[PDB]
Amino acid sequence: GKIEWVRVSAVVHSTEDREKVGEAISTLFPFEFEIAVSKMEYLEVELTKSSEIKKFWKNLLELLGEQAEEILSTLEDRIDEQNVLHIRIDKQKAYLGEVSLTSGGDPIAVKLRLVTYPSKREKVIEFARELCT
Amino acid sequence: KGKIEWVRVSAVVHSTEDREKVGEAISTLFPFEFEIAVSKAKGHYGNPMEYLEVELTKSSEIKKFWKNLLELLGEQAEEILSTLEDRIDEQNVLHIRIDKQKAYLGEVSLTSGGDPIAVKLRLVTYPSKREKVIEFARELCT
Amino acid sequence: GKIEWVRVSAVVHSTEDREKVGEAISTLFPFEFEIAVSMEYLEVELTKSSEIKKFWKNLLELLGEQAEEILSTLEDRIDEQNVLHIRIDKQKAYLGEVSLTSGGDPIAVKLRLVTYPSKREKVIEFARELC
Amino acid sequence: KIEWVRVSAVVHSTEDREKVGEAISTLFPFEFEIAVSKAKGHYGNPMEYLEVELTKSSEIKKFWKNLLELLGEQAEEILSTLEDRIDEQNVLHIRIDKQKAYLGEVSLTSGGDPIAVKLRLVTYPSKREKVIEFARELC
C-alpha cells in the first residue's frame, strides 16, 4: 500500500507562545513545510507530495529510534477504522529538539493515512509492520 | 473536501408578530422534523424581542437539509457561488439570509432586507485555510 | 383653519398578526373607531371635528417632548395638498407609547389642513398651531 | 467601561492604501492617525496593515455613539449574535463593509475582508455574561 498523506498538528494555549509551539513542530521536519494557524488556536501541517511523505517518515523513525519498536507493538490500537495511524509526540521535548512519544493529552499529533489494496485491516496492519521497519 | 460542522437557522419575532406564523416561514427551509429554541431579550432599541434558532448537528440532517436548501433556492445558487467571498467570514462561516416573508409562503429567496432568516453553516477543512475553505464551499454548491 | 380629516393607516405582512397590529393603532384613539381592512393595509378615518379634535389633543399629549420635533420640521412633514404626516413606531405603539420613527414600517398618521385660502404660507402658520 | 477601540484594515497589492484609508475615515467623526505595517493575507499574499487606536474616552465614547448611529437598524443584527462577536479576550467585533465604507456608507459585512472594529469590554465583576450583558448596554 501507500501513505495517502501525513498530518502534523498541535494546540496553543493562552499561556502558551505560538512561535514556541511551532518551533516544537519544526523538529519533525527535515525540509521546508508550512504551518496553518487557526482559532486556543491550532497549528496544522500537511504532507501530500509522496517524496516529502516518504522522506518525513523515514526521518521520524530515525529520530524515534528504539521507540519505533513500541509503535509496532501497538499498531493495532494506533490505527483507526479509517486506517489512519496515530503517533503522539511530546510537545515540550520536541521544542527542545528531542523526538519522543507521549501518552499525554496535549501532544503534537502525527497522523498517517494508510491505503492498501484493498483496505483490509489485516493488510493495513501488515503494511504498517513493514512500514515501521 | 471538508465538512459542515453545524448549521444554524434563525429569525426574530417582533411584538406585532406571530411565533407560529414565523416558525412556519422557518420550516419552509426544512424537509424533515425539527426543534426550535426560543430566547427573549430587548431589541436594538428598547423593544422586547423574541429570537428563534434551529441548529442541525447530525451530519444526516445537515446534508439532507443542505441538498434541500440548494434544491429550493435553485437558480439563485449561482449567485451564492459568485458571491462566496462576501458570505464566508474569517471564522469560516457561510452566511445565507432568506426573505422572511416569501418564506412564509414556501418560497426561498435571498434577500438584503433588514429582517430575514439567517442561515449560518460552519465549514471545517484540513488545513483550516481560507483557500481550502472557499474551495469546499464552492463544492457544496453541487 | 381646520382639519378636513384624519386617517391612520398601517400594514400587516404575512408573518404579522392583524389583531396585534390594530391594538397598536388603538393606542392613539381615546374613543370608538373602526378599522377598514383593505400583505394587507388597515385604515381608520376621522371626519367628525369632535373626534378630529379629541385625536389631535390626545396625540400631542402622548408625544410630549417629541411634539417639539414635529414643530421643527413642518415644511417637510407637510406635503403638497397641505397634508401633514406623522409616522410612528408600530412596535412601541403596540406597547403603548407614541414615538415618531424614521423606520420603514410605521403607523402613518396624516391629516389634511385647510386655510382660507389654503396658502402654503398661512397653512404652515396654522400647522404650527402647537401649544 | 470600554477599555480600547481599534479599527484596522488590510491592503492588497492591487489596492490603493489611500483609498483604503479613506474608507476608514468614513468611520471617524474626528481626526485620527493610521499606523502602517506588513502582514499576510488569507491566501498568504504580502499585505499592508492599517490600524487606528483610541484610548481617550472622549474620542472613544464619541466614536461608539456615532458608529452606532451610522449603523442604524443594523445594530439589531449585532445583538442577535452578540456572543460570537465576543472572544475570550473580551473583545467586541463589529465587521464593516470596506467597499461601502469607501463609498462613504456604513454597513455590516459577512465576507472575509472587512474593516475590523474591535472593542475591549471591561466589567467590574469580569465574567462572560458580565460583558455579554454589558454589550447589550451599548444599545
Numbering used by the authors:
A (entry chain A): 4 to 42, 51 to 144
B (entry chain D): 3 to 144
C (entry chain C): 4 to 41, 51 to 143
D (entry chain B): 5 to 143
How did the manuscript describe this experimental structure?
UPF0201 family proteins constitute one such uncharacterized, archaeal specific protein family. The UPF0201 family proteins occur as a single globular α/β domain with approximate dimensions of 55×35×35 Å3. The protomeric structure consists of a five-stranded, anti-parallel β-sheet, five α helices, which are located on one face of the β-sheet, and three loops connecting helices and strands. We have further documented that all members of this archaeal specific protein family share a common polypeptide chain fold, which is evolutionarily related to the RRM motif found in the ribosomal L5 proteins and many other RNA-binding proteins.
For 10077d from A. fulgidus, the N-terminal His6 tagged full length protein gave crystals and a structure, whereas the C-terminal His6 tagged version yielded neither. In none of the three X-ray structures of full-length UPF0201 proteins was electron density corresponding to the 15–20 C-terminal residues observed. The loop connecting β2 and β3 protrudes somewhat from the globular domain, and the electron density corresponding to this region is poorly defined in the 10077b and 10077d structures. Our four UPF0201 structures represent subfamilies N149845 (10077a, b) and N130963 (10077c, d).
